[PDB]
Structure formats: structure tokens, C-alpha cells
Amino acid sequence: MADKFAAKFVSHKISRTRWRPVSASSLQQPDVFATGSWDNEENKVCVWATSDFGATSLDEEYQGDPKQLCDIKHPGDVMDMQFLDKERIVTGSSTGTVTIFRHHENNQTLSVNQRWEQAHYHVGSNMRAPCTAIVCSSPEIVSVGEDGRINCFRAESRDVLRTIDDADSSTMHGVTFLRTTEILTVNSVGQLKLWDLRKQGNDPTQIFSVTGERVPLHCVDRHPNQQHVVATGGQDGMLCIWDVRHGKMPMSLLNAHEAEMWEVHFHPSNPDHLFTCSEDGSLWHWDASADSEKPTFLLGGRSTFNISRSSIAPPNANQSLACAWLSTDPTKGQLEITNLLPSSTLSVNSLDVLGQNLVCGTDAEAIYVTRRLFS
């Protein structure tokens, strides 16, 4: 059952649907994905395979219905995850258990490759906290929790390989990599804090905040083309454009949306594409990095579209753009917004794009997969 999108009803509250990485790979597009269930009776991690719509060469056709290959119990809820490789998945648990599973495309089962039954406790009272955010950078894995501590693990380690402690408890929302050795997080108050993974100890290494326009920040990602460029989604729906590797003050604050920003991700095979979800259930397609190809309808800032080369025009004096660092108002940083879909189902909480392929999960226990209108 698909219209412009694979619609899969699994009757399980969808928490995680991430491609067992196949985009930018082989001569075959993604068709294998890993699923993590939340608030379902069997809190579980599954492998699933989706088939191409219609009938193609030697691929046993199929009009739809992606199928589970294997399932395994995950104690507690299943919140955060990253593919350590195609064959290893890293998952957090509410019980303080962080599990890397070695899953198999050969026999279709998951095996407990590694399990940290204990991790991530705030320093000052040594209270346990759940693993709030996770991001893998092979071989390193960087995790944070609402304790405010940071844990750097390796795939094969059983101990906390590196721990950045803190005496100031902070509830974060999302994490990303500034460099190979640098991590950044959003904070539930609109703060972006930086720590050196090679410098350890209590109290945040550095804290920075949105200036003038202040909303709590719920998501962060480094831009693929520029990791120093960082995007953060917030509670209001305001978007901040950053050029940050040591920065403190945002150089673009644009009040875009009026609903909380769950997640926005860069298209990996097209970082000029960005995909955006909202709490109401609506979705948005962005086609721009520092330019404009789509329009935008509620974004702040100045300027739309781009000037063309070749001069056939009256003799004009045109001025270069102003010093954006001299102001704290919505200005350039345009990345466009297109309402390809207003709310259609229950609140969408997770979306992902790998290559020209997109997947997302809703509170309707439904998975929606798209492949066009951006490819």
C-alpha cells in the first residue's frame, strides 16, 4: 500500500526506524532497516527488509509490506540509537544498559555483541540517568544523558573509556559532532554547550546561548558540507544558522515555525536538502544551504532565490550583503521551507534520510517511506 510512500502498519509504537546503511552504497539502493519499539509490550530491536514497489529485475517484485527478519528483547524503553556499522547497532536502554548488537544479514538474527549494563551517572551525587542522546563516529561512540555527563565508548570496550563529568545537572535533547574529536549539544533552555573529549572534569567546558530570540533547543546536527555550520531546532520552531567551532552568539535567528521541532536532518547525498517534522504531524521540505531553490513561507531573514550569471541588465551598482555579526535579528541563513504535507496522521516524532531515501515513524504505529519530489 503506497501512493508516493510506503505505508507500513506494524501496530507497534514506532521509536526507531533507521536504515541499516545502504544509501551511497553498492549498485543497490536501501532496502534493509533496523527498528526499535517503544512503549510496546515487547520492547524490542528488530531487523526488517523492505521490497521495491512493483516488479523489477530478479528481485521477486512486491507491491509493499516490508517484513521482519528477526526480533530480540530490549529491556526498558528504546530511545536512542546509531549504526556503529552496517552489522553493529548501538542502542540505549532506560535501565542504564547500552547494547551493541551484531546483527546478521546471512542468518537474520541479532546477537548481543556488547552490553554496558552500567553507564552515565552525574557527578556530585552519582545518580543514574538514561542515555539521552547517542552518536557514533567509528570507532568512537559519544553518548550523553540528562545527568549531564558524557561517555565516550568503543565498540569492544566494557568500561567507560572516557567520561566527562559534571556537577551541574542538565537535561539535553540532541547531540552532534563538530569534529572527529568535538561534540555539541542542544539544551532544554536553548543552550549549546561544547566539551573537549580530551579534557575531562565537572562543570560545562563552554556554554553558549541564542541571543535576543530565546527558545529551548530540541535538536542539533552539524551540516554535512560544514560541520562548523550547525542547525538547531527548538520549542517554538525558530531556526538558528550558525558558523560555530568556538562561537558564542548565533549569527542567524529566524522565527520559522510555531510548533516544537522534533528533528530536522540533512539529506546525506544532498545536504542542500533538509527534511523537517513537527509535533502537529506536519512535514516540510527544505532545498537550500546558503542559497534558495524552493520558496519559504514562515521563515525569517532576508532575501529569496539567487542571482544569475551573465550581465544583461541596466548599469547598476549592487551592494554586498551586510555584516551579519553586527546585528542580532533575522537575516541571511535561508534554507527554505515547503509544506509538502500538513498534518495527516498522529504526531511524527522520528524521521531519517539516507541517500535519496527517506523513512519516518509516527505515534500511529506507522512507518512512512518516501523516495521522490526531492530526488
**Interface residue list for other proteins (CB under 8 A):** 22, 24-28, 31-32, 49, 51-52, 54-61, 69, 85-88, 102, 105-108, 113, 137-138, 155-156, 179-181, 224-228, 243, 245-246, 268-269, 290-291, 307-311, 314-323, 325-326
In one letter, which amino acid is 106?
Answer: N
Nearer to other proteins, 31 or 165 (CB): 31
What are the b/e assignments for 116-149, b being 16+ CB within 10 Å?
A: beebbbbbeeeeebbbbbbbbeeebbbbbbbbbb
CB of 215 to other proteins, least distance (A): 25
- Number of C-alpha atoms within 13 angstroms, CB side, residue 83? 18
Contacts of 353 (CB under 8 A, 6+ apart): 265, 266, 267, 268, 273, 275, 359
CB of 136 to other proteins, least distance (A): 9
Greatest C-alpha distance within the chain: 71
H or E element in which residue 152 lies: strand 150-154
CB of 321 to other proteins, least distance (A): 7
Count CB atoms within 10 A of the CB of residue 204. Answer: 18
Nearer to other proteins, 62 or 347 (CB): 62
Nearer to other proteins, 228 or 302 (CB): 228
Nearer to other proteins, 59 or 117 (CB): 59
Nearer to other proteins, 52 or 260 (CB): 52
Rounded Cα–Cα distance for residues 158 and 135 (Å): 18
Nearer to other proteins, 317 or 373 (CB): 317
Nearer to other proteins, 225 or 339 (CB): 225
CB of 114 to other proteins, least distance (A): 9
How far apart, in Å, are the Cα atoms of 159 and each of 49, 163, 346? 34, 10, 40
Give the burial class of 180: count Cβ atoms within 10 A of its Cβ; 0-12 exposed, 13-18 middle, 19 or more buried.
Answer: exposed
User: In this structure, what C-alpha cell is assigned to residue 16?
Assistant: 526507531
CB of 147 to other proteins, least distance (A): 26
How far apart, in Å, are the Cα atoms of 276 and each of 20, 84, 284, 353, 367? 21, 24, 5, 10, 16
Sheet strands (E) in 245-365: 253-255, 264-267, 270-277, 283-287, 338-341, 348-354, 357-362
CB of 363 to other proteins, least distance (A): 29
Rounded Cα–Cα distance for residues 126 and 121 (Å): 5
Residue with cell 509504537: 13
Nearer to other proteins, 229 or 253 (CB): 229
Nearer to other proteins, 17 or 362 (CB): 17
CB of 102 to other proteins, least distance (A): 6
Nearer to other proteins, 163 or 170 (CB): 163
CB of 225 to other proteins, least distance (A): 7
Our measurement of the distance from residue 288's CA atom to the centroid of its chain's CA atoms, rounded to an integer in Å, reads 18
CB of 364 to other proteins, least distance (A): 27
- Number of C-alpha atoms within 13 angstroms, CB side, residue 322? 14
CB of 37 to other proteins, least distance (A): 21
